[PDB]
């Protein structure tokens, strides 16, 4: 189909004409994000039993 193939061209032109950053900078940003949030991540930084809703505890709210 010629309508389809022209649609593909228009689409690819939208995809091509975007601003891209360097991988080295994109990667540094992900790393910095993980580092700023490492201490608030309980799967990473295991919490004391007393702060952990799923250990040593029967009395809950709602």
């Amino acid at each position: 189909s010629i309508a389809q193939a022209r649609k593909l061209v228009e689409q690819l032109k939208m995809e091509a004409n975007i601003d891209r950053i360097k991988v080295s900078k994109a990667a540094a940003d992900l790393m910095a994000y993980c580092e700023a949030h490492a201490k608030e991540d309980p799967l990473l930084t295991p919490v004391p039993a007393s702060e952990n809703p799923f250990r040593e505890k029967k009395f809950f709210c709602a």
């Binding site: 032109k13 994109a26 990667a27 994000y33 952990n52």
Partner: protein
């Protein structure tokens, strides 16, 4: 001819995209993160087992309170669970047996689900009276409902076997925007933290980034060798991960417009069903058809740990918004909550 030429200019545009991506590939995530310590051995126990589905579980979704969750099963029900006590807050028998997906609205007022009925059904969890009712049956897809996620109580995004996604106005029951572009069944979707963008993963082995408000495909990501079954945004919105039938997960960056990392091991040969990040984005957790959940260092690519608590496929998973736990759901009819 015209068709000869439009194909050739498409191919040439694909080369220019490829060339401009390579021009950005000045280093790797793996090189950039060489100096940070490994996360060590990630080890968790099963803190709850959620029993009550009578057959395979296909999906799950946490409420925003990090406490309730909704699961969907081959038994033709949704169950809404209180993960803290393990009690069933609601058990919802569906109109169609063939449910495949489910979603918890951020407010906690609705769930949604659907499957081979090709419908996204919306359930009002607290009526005027205090009953659980179907409040809307979103009809319009031409093939199965694969995933659905609420933006708010009046808007939801769906993906489908008909190769499209859509944005729905729940009140009118109508598709407000249709996202067309995939050439295979769309299997999964994930909303950006700000809900202006979403990404989809499909059986054409690509992921696409969509503008919610304006209706277009902004970027297309390739590299998987086979179906993408699952997708999830990295928590700052600038990257996302996919899981595929090719036995790999991958990390894609939006602004660099390319793949940053592959997460795989020569001993893992089956498909990934499900992906989610830990609260900080440092861990990528994925479910596998070999009955495990593997936990990856998202920055460094090493396998950090394994959750091995199911007797059949891990079909779904999710990390709570408070980061405190991970839920796994399985073909063995159980969910487990781990930390």
């Amino acid at each position: 001819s015209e068709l000869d030429q439009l194909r050739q200019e498409a191919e040439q545009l694909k080369n220019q995209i490829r060339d401009a991506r390579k021009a950005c590939a000045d280093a790797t995530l793996s090189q950039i993160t060489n100096n940070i310590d490994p996360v060590g051995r990630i080890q968790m126990r099963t803190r709850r087992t959620l029993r009550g589905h009578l057959a395979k579980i296909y999906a799950m979704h946490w409420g925003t309170d990090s406490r309730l969750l909704v699961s969907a099963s081959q038994d033709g029900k949704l169950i809404i669970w209180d993960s803290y006590t393990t009690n069933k807050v609601h058990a919802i028998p569906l109109r169609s047996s063939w449910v495949m997906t489910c979603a918890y609205a951020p407010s906690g007022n609705y769930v949604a689900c659907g499957g081979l009925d090709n419908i996204c059904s919306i359930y009002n969890l607290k009526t005027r009276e205090g009953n659980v009712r179907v409040s809307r049956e979103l009809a319009g897809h031409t093939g199965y409902l694969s995933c659905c996620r609420f933006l708010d109580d009046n808007q939801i995004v769906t993906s489908s076997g008909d190769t499209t996604c859509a944005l729905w106005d729940i009140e009118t029951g109508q598709q407000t925007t249709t996202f067309t572009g995939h050439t295979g069944d769309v299997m999964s979707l994930s909303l950006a933290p700000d809900t202006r963008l979403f990404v989809s993963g499909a059986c054409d082995a690509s992921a696409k980034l969509w503008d919610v408000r304006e209706g277009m495909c902004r970027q297309t990501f390739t590299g998987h060798e086979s179906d993408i079954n699952a997708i999830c945004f990295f928590p700052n919105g600038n990257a996302f991960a996919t899981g595929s039938d090719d036995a790999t997960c991958r990390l894609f960056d939006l602004r660099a417009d390319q793949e940053l990392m592959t997460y795989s091991h020569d001993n893992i040969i089956c498909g990934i069903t499900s992906v989610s990040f830990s609260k900080s984005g440092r861990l990528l957790l994925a479910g596998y058809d070999d009955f495990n959940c593997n936990v990856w260092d998202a920055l460094k690519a090493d396998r950090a740990g394994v959750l091995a608590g199911h007797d059949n496929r891990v079909s779904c998973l999710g990390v709570t918004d408070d980061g405190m736990a991970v839920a796994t759901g399985s073909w063995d009819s159980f969910l487990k909550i781990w930390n």
